[PDB]
Amino acid sequence: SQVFGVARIYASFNDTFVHVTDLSGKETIARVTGGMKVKADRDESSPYAAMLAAQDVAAKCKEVGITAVHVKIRATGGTRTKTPGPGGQAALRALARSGLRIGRIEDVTPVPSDSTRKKGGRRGRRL
Amino acid sequence: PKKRASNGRNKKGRGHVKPVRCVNCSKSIPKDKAIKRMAIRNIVEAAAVRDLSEASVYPEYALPKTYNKLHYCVSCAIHARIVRVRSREDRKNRAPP
Amino acid sequence: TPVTLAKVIKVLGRTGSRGGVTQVRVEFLEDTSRTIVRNVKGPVRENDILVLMESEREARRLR
Amino acid sequence: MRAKWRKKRTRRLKRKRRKVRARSK
Amino acid sequence: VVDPFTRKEWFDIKAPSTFENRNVGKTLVNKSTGLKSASDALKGRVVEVCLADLQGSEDHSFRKIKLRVDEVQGKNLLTNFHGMDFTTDKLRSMVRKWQTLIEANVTVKTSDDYVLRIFAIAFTRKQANQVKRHSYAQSSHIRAIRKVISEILTKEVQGSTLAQLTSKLIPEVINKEIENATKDIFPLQNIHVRKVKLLKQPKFDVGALMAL
RNA sequence: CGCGGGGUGGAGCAGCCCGGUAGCUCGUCGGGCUCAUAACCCGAAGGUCGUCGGUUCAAAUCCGGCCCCCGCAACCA
RNA sequence: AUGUUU
RNA sequence: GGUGAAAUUCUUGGAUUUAUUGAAGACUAACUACUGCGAAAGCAUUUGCCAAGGACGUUUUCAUUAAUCAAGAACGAAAGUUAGGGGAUCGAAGAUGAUCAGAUACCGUCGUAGUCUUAACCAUAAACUAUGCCGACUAGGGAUCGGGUGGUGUUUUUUUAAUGACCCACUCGGCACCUUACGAGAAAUCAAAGUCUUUGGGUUCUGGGGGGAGUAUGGUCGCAAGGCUGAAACUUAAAGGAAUUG
RNA sequence: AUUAUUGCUCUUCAACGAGGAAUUCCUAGUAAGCGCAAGUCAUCAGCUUGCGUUGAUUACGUCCCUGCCCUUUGUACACACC
Numbered sequence: 026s027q028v029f030g031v032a033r034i035y036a037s038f039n040d041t042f043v044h045v046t047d048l049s050g051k052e053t054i055a056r057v058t059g060g061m062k063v064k065a066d067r068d069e070s071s072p073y074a075a076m077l078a079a080q081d082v083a084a085k086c087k088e089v090g091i092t093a094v095h096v097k098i099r100a101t102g103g104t105r106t107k108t109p110g111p112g113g114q115a116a117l118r119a120l121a122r123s124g125l126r127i128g129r130i131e132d133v134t135p136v137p138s139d140s141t142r143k144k145g146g147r148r149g150r151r152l
Numbered sequence: 153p154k155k156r157a158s159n160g161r162n163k164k165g166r167g168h169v170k171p172v173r174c175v176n177c178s179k180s181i182p183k184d185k186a187i188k189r190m191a192i193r194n195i196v197e198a199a200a201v202r203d204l205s206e207a208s209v210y211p212e213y214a215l216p217k218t219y220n221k222l223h224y225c226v227s228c229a230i231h232a233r234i235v236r237v238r239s240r241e242d243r244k245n246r247a248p249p
Numbered sequence: 250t251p252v253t254l255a256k257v258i259k260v261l262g263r264t265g266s267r268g269g270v271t272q273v274r275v276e277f278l279e280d281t282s283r284t285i286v287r288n289v290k291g292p293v294r295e296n297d298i299l300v301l302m303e304s305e306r307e308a309r310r311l312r
Numbered sequence: 313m314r315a316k317w318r319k320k321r322t323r324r325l326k327r328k329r330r331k332v333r334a335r336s337k
Numbered sequence: 338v339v340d341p342f343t344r345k346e347w348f349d350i351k352a353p354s355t356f357e358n359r360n361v362g363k364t365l366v367n368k369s370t371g372l373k374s375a376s377d378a379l380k381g382r383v384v385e386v387c388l389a390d391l392q393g394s395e396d397h398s399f400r401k402i403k404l405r406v407d408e409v410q411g412k413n414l415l416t417n418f419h420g421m422d423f424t425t426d427k428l429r430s431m432v433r434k435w436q437t438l439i440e441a442n443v444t445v446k447t448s449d450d451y452v453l454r455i456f457a458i459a460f461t462r463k464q465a466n467q468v469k470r471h472s473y474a475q476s477s478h479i480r481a482i483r484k485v486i487s488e489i490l491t492k493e494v495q496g497s498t499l500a501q502l503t504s505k506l507i508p509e510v511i512n513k514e515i516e517n518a519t520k521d522i523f524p525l526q527n528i529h530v531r532k533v534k535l536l537k538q539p540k541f542d543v544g545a546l547m548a549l
Numbered sequence: 550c551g552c553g554g555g556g557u558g559g560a561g562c563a564g565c566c567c568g569g570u571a572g573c574u575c576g577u578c579g580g581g582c583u584c585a586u587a588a589c590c591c592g593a594a595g596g597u598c599g600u601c602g603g604u605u606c607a608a609a610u611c612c613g614g615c616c617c618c619c620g621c622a623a624c625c626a
Numbered sequence: 627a628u629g630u631u632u
Numbered sequence: 633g634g635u636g637a638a639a640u641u642c643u644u645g646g647a648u649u650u651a652u653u654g655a656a657g658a659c660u661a662a663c664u665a666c667u668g669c670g671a672a673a674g675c676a677u678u679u680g681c682c683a684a685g686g687a688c689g690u691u692u693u694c695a696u697u698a699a700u701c702a703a704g705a706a707c708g709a710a711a712g713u714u715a716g717g718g719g720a721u722c723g724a725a726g727a728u729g730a731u732c733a734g735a736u737a738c739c740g741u742c743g744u745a746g747u748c749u750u751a752a753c754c755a756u757a758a759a760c761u762a763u764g765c766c767g768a769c770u771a772g773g774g775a776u777c778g779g780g781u782g783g784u785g786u787u788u789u790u791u792u793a794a795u796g797a798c799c800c801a802c803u804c805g806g807c808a809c810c811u812u813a814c815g816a817g818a819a820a821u822c823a824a825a826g827u828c829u830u831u832g833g834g835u836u837c838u839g840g841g842g843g844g845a846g847u848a849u850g851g852u853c854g855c856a857a858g859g860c861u862g863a864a865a866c867u868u869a870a871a872g873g874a875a876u877u878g
Numbered sequence: 879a880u881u882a883u884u885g886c887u888c889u890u891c892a893a894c895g896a897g898g899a900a901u902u903c904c905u906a907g908u909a910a911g912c913g914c915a916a917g918u919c920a921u922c923a924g925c926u927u928g929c930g931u932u933g934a935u936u937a938c939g940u941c942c943c944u945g946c947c948c949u950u951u952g953u954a955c956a957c958a959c960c
């Protein structure tokens with residue numbers, strides 16, 4: 026009764042990407058970022074920016090013709106954070122509320138088996 | 153003098169424990185010394201469980217939970233208030249609050 | 250526009266970042282055997298009647 | 313002075329002494 | 338000024354031959370052209386599907402499946418099984434402190450030509466009357482149990498194709514077999530087949546591939 | 550000598566490719582928060598588009614010359 | 627974010 | 633992209649982001665604990681091989697064969713050195729961006745040596761439990777690890793019984809832990825830092841106010857960096873330890 | 879009495895179309911509007927001190943903002959962070 030895409034929320038610190046693609050993932054649809062919807066150089070990760078980007082992506086999705094999305098959310102992962110950014114929740118807010126249907130919330134944050142010795146040195150960032 | 157009865161870590165009979173990196177500042181930490189907190193916060197609460205369940209195409213969806221073990225150096229743990237400076241007698245209290 | 254009226258029966262406590270809202274135990278008039286936790290900004294005491302548009306949204310603590 | 317940096321400065325001084333004594337024969 | 342979605346066509350993926358349902362969804366791609374055929378741009382696309390969506394029952398919410406398109410028959414993407422892995426949420430809900438995790442792995446070739454790497458997972462459990470609050474193994478029980486799991490896994494595979502392997506993993510009969518074969522060594526509650534991965538593909542062999 | 554590019558507030562740029570009409574980043578000035586600067590918020594000053602002619606319902610924008618800077622290419626008084 | 631000495 | 637904010641920088645040669653693969657090196661998450669082994673440094677993916685190890689059990693054997701140990705030897709984190717290989721990430725140096733009054737730092741980006749391995753050095757750490765080893769005794773208690781003993785035990789079945797896991801009772805050895813301390817200490821605290829002016833179980837090492845100084849010199853080891861041994865002149869009334877009040 | 883002390887009369891009638899970031903006071907006869915008495919005085923109120931008249935709104939709480947108090951904590955400070 027519906028047609029399935031993939032939400033591909035990439036909510037890092039300093040930015041949140043909303044990337045809705047086909048079920049395969051090779052073909053992209055309306056890849057929108059928070060920096061596209063705010064120009065301050067510090068609010069790209071803000072919940073308002075993420076919400077506006079997700080609303081635009083949902084409008085473009087409902088103009089292409091995709092109705093429901095399996096949601097794959099991730100942080101930077103790798104070696105840096107492992108923690109989803111503040112804007113992912115707002116982006117999913119907008120995706121759910123803009124008429125798109127939501128399915129299979131999933132965390133695809135990349136987690137290593139103690140690889141890629143972390144950036145910052147053994148004494149870390151000294152602020 | 154000696155501030156803590158054993159040490160500011162948990163190591164008796166080992167000598168060396170392989171190190172870990174602070175999640176917040178990336179400082180190298182002994183694994184037993186690092187403040188370890190398991191975050192089992194749900195993937196999407198966002199005051200939005202109702203919205204997500206309504207937009208869900210899955211009945212009784214039972215949205216999943218994200219697990220993440222955070223390791224802090226004591227400086228970052230104090231600064232972000234995972235741990236707090238306790239009284240001299242209250243330091244001898246290992247039960248969680 | 251869905252309509253439903255209820256009444257506060259147990260005042261829970263003061264809540265809010267600035268401490269403006271009050272948590273209230275909401276007893277419905279229709280199908281009364283249900284108590285709902287909700288948030289109200291204005292002054293409230295017991296046996297006061299409230300109007301809520303949404304029917305199922307449990308207001309949790311405001312942090 | 314940190315004792316570490318005092319030791320490092322002393323080591324540099326000792327290296328200079330070794331160089332000058334190597335020159336002087 | 339271009340709107341690349343105006344020249345794209347949709348395809349319905351009739352992915353499984355055996356799970357419960359042929360149809361899993363739709364996918365869009367640019368129209369075939371002179372030096373770039375639509376079937377040529379396809380045949381490599383893989384879809385990521387939920388086993389609960391495949392079987393109709395929510396008791397398969399984890400064990401997501403990869404399926405790669407192998408041929409196009411009139412806007413119908415015929416795939417074949419490509420791999421299964423647990424979700425991160427499920428994996429982190431199974432892994433807990435105050436218990437011993439045991440992971441085992443094999444590399445085995447199925448009956449006809451199919452090469453798979455299999456990852457089995459399990460965790461220790463507490464007894465009904467146990468007072469001790471960790472219930473750890475003695476690591477010799479762990480070595481023996483993982484030997485047994487590898488033996489059972491290599492005995493189940495190499496006599497089954499992907500089709501029969503799916504017909505055994507979906508009812509999780511292998512998990513119960515591991516539980517029954519290791520219940521005399523350690524209780525080992527949380528038996529699962531955490532992952533199956535494709536390593537090498539054989540000749541296309543459409544004759545056996547078209548089983549539906 | 551030929552073909553192309555460039556000149557826009559005090560400095561750097563979009564605007565031009567088919568007129569609603571000069572702005573953006575930094576510095577400069579004023580007020581605001583702070584115990585005080587910085588970051589920041591709100592205001593204020595700034596050229597009239599390199600210089601001329603021409604075309605144009607009203608041209609920096611398109612056209613034809615000149616001054617400057619640039620790349621390539623050619624040289625029988 | 628920074629605010630030097632007596 | 634990155635930051636508190638920026639900027640260096642990549643970017644209509646399609647950068648960031650998505651998907652399918654491959655190559656490289658490093659590492660072994662989550663399980664991971666007041667838990668284990670090792671003489672220490674250290675040791676955490678599977679399997680095989682290779683030898684070794686402590687505890688336990690013993691109505692087995694030897695019978696003083698033992699304890700600590702100058703000189704003397706083996707190993708010895710990281711960093712560094714030599715010659716090959718490898719070089720992903722991080723990253724002393726170096727180069728750049730911003731703040732600063734200056735910022736040759738903290739913060740951001742790139743990035744050499746190094747980070748990995750083989751064969752040789754190096755022999756140094758807050759190499760710490762800042763607590764030598766062996767032996768005996770002096771409170772109580774509960775967990776935990778490995779082993780052994782018993783149960784009208786619970787659970788697992790194969791078919792009596794039995795190992796497996798579990799509970800209880802111990803017992804030996806171990807990492808520790810909590811209370812109380814006769815006792816000790818200046819106190820913090822300590823089951824050893826107790827059995828010390830009522831001072832002797834055995835034995836090795838180190839120290840004699842703070843600087844100069846772990847320096848100079850001599851010797852010795854090292855390719856080097858340096859390691860070991862190691863003063864004196866001179867100078868000073870305090871330095872220092874614990875705890876208390878502001 | 880000029881650099882009008884002040885009072886009064888006539889006469890061109892200027893900005894201001896409700897206010898920017900910010901910022902001050904305040905919980906019931908209170909804020910606000912209003913004038914009166916006194917003080918400063920030979921004279922001069924927009925000032926201040928007291929007063930009365932008209933007299934609301936919202937709240938009956940909180941530690942997010944600021945400041946302060948207490949407790950804990952660190953100190954190599956004790957003339958005590960000048």
Ligand SMILES: [K+]
Pocket residue numbers: 719
């Ligand atoms: K390198």
Ligand SMILES: [Mg+2]
Pocket residue numbers: 152
């Ligand atoms: Mg700091």
Ligand SMILES: [Mg+2]
Pocket residue numbers: 153
């Ligand atoms: Mg201290």
Ligand SMILES: [Mg+2]
Pocket residue numbers: 167168759
């Ligand atoms: Mg050590």
Ligand SMILES: [Mg+2]
Pocket residue numbers: 632
């Ligand atoms: Mg002074």
Ligand SMILES: [Mg+2]
Pocket residue numbers: 668
């Ligand atoms: Mg263990």
Ligand SMILES: [Mg+2]
Pocket residue numbers: 660677
């Ligand atoms: Mg592992």
Ligand SMILES: [Mg+2]
Pocket residue numbers: none
């Ligand atoms: Mg010796």
Ligand SMILES: [Mg+2]
Pocket residue numbers: 710
């Ligand atoms: Mg080394």
Ligand SMILES: [Mg+2]
Pocket residue numbers: 738
């Ligand atoms: Mg600084």
Ligand SMILES: [Mg+2]
Pocket residue numbers: none
């Ligand atoms: Mg030493």
Ligand SMILES: [Mg+2]
Pocket residue numbers: 841
């Ligand atoms: Mg002395």
Ligand SMILES: [Mg+2]
Pocket residue numbers: none
């Ligand atoms: Mg002291």
Ligand SMILES: [Mg+2]
Pocket residue numbers: 925
């Ligand atoms: Mg006055």
Ligand SMILES: [Zn+2]
Pocket residue numbers: 149174175176177178179224225226227228229
């Ligand atoms: Zn940290």
